Amino acid sequence: SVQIVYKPVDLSKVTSKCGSLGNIHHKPGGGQVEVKSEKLDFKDRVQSKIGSLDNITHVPGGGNKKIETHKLTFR
Amino acid sequence: SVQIVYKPVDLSKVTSKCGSLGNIHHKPGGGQVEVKSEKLDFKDRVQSKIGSLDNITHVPGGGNKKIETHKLTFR
Amino acid sequence: SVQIVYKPVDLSKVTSKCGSLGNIHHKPGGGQVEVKSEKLDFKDRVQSKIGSLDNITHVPGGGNKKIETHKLTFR
Amino acid sequence: SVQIVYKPVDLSKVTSKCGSLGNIHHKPGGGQVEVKSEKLDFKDRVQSKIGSLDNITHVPGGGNKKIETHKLTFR
Amino acid sequence: SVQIVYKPVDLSKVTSKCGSLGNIHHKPGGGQVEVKSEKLDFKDRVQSKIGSLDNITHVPGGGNKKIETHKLTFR
Amino acid sequence: SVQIVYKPVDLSKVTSKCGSLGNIHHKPGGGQVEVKSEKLDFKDRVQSKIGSLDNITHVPGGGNKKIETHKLTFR
């Protein structure tokens, strides 16, 4: 006689908390911004940002990836 | 005689909390922004942003990916 | 006679908390910013940022990756 | 021959969240309270409270009680 | 022959979160309280409280109580 | 022959988080309290409190209690 019992159990947790969480910002204050430009020249792509206060959260990450394999094989 | 019992159990959790979460902003204040331009020239694509206050959340990430395989095989 | 019992149990946690968490910022204050530009020339991509206060959280990381294998084999 | 295996598993949760939780109160404003008392008589206990704004959380409850008994008995 | 295996497992949680939790109060404002008392008489205990703004959290409760019994008994 | 393997496992958690926790109070304001008392009489104990602002946390409770009896008994 042969008996095989195959009963792996998974109760595990996987978790990511990525970015800005639970922070307090109280009266954050951008000052005056002046940009003055004259007679400039450009011969390729210009990417420009101007501003008094920028608050930015950027999250390419925090991804979860679970790979699981089971392979009971007999004779 | 042969007996195979194949009863893997999955109760596992996967979670992502990506971006800006639970934050408090109290009276965030952008200042005056002045941009002045004269006699400029451009010969390729211009991307421009101007503003007093920018609050931004960008999340390309936070994706969950579960891949699972079972392969009971006999003779 | 043969009896095989295969019962691995997983109760594990995997966790990441990446970025800015639980911080307090009280009256953070950007100063006056003045940019004055004249007769500049550019032959390349221009990437430009100007601003009084920038608060930035960038998280490419904090990803979780679990790879798990089971391979009971008989004769 | 006799074999007895006694392996109850407990993974249970018990939880109470009693009182005031997660509320927001914005500018709650008690009015003017004026009490004028004259020529009174009291012949037993006086218990007295006077006030403009009261926030009160009282929790006599929210208790958790787990009673667990195991009694394997043989002949 | 006799074999007894007695291996009960407890992984359970018990938790209480009793009182005032995670609340936000923004500018809560008690008003003026005026008490004027004249020619009064008292012939037993006086308990008295007067005040403009009261925040009170009182927790006689929230207790956790685990009672656990094991009584393997043989012949 | 007789064999007894008494090996119970406890991995359980017990926890109380009683009182005031994680709250935010921004500029809480008691108003003016005026008490004027004239020609009074008291013939037993006086307990008295007067004040503009109170913040009271009182926790007679929140206790954790565990009782755990093991009684392997043989012939």
XYZ file of N, CA and C in Angstrom, chain D residues 53 55, chain E residues 49-56, chain F residues 30 49-56:
57
model
N -18.740 74.273 27.309
C -18.556 73.158 26.373
C -17.978 71.938 27.087
N -16.907 67.961 26.239
C -16.738 66.732 25.479
C -16.399 65.623 26.473
N -18.337 71.291 40.348
C -17.379 71.578 39.270
C -17.882 72.737 38.425
N -17.016 73.699 38.132
C -17.335 74.843 37.280
C -16.207 75.014 36.271
N -16.506 75.165 34.983
C -15.451 75.422 34.007
C -15.920 75.698 32.593
N -15.132 76.433 31.811
C -15.534 76.813 30.457
C -15.479 75.665 29.447
N -14.351 74.964 29.323
C -14.196 73.830 28.410
C -13.655 72.611 29.145
N -14.367 71.496 29.071
C -13.935 70.219 29.631
C -13.793 69.188 28.524
N -12.617 68.594 28.373
C -12.468 67.334 27.660
C -12.176 66.237 28.687
N -13.020 65.212 28.769
C -12.881 64.126 29.747
C -12.963 62.787 29.024
N -10.446 77.515 26.483
C -11.370 77.838 27.562
C -11.641 79.342 27.590
N -13.998 72.189 42.351
C -13.028 72.509 41.283
C -13.554 73.619 40.383
N -12.705 74.590 40.070
C -13.018 75.726 39.201
C -11.865 75.878 38.208
N -12.118 76.045 36.910
C -11.040 76.285 35.941
C -11.499 76.549 34.512
N -10.704 77.264 33.720
C -11.065 77.642 32.351
C -11.078 76.460 31.377
N -10.024 75.645 31.343
C -9.928 74.470 30.475
C -9.416 73.246 31.234
N -10.079 72.108 31.069
C -9.635 70.802 31.566
C -9.428 69.817 30.418
N -8.408 68.978 30.539
C -8.216 67.801 29.709
C -7.861 66.636 30.633
N -8.834 65.787 30.941
C -8.709 64.689 31.907
C -8.744 63.350 31.174
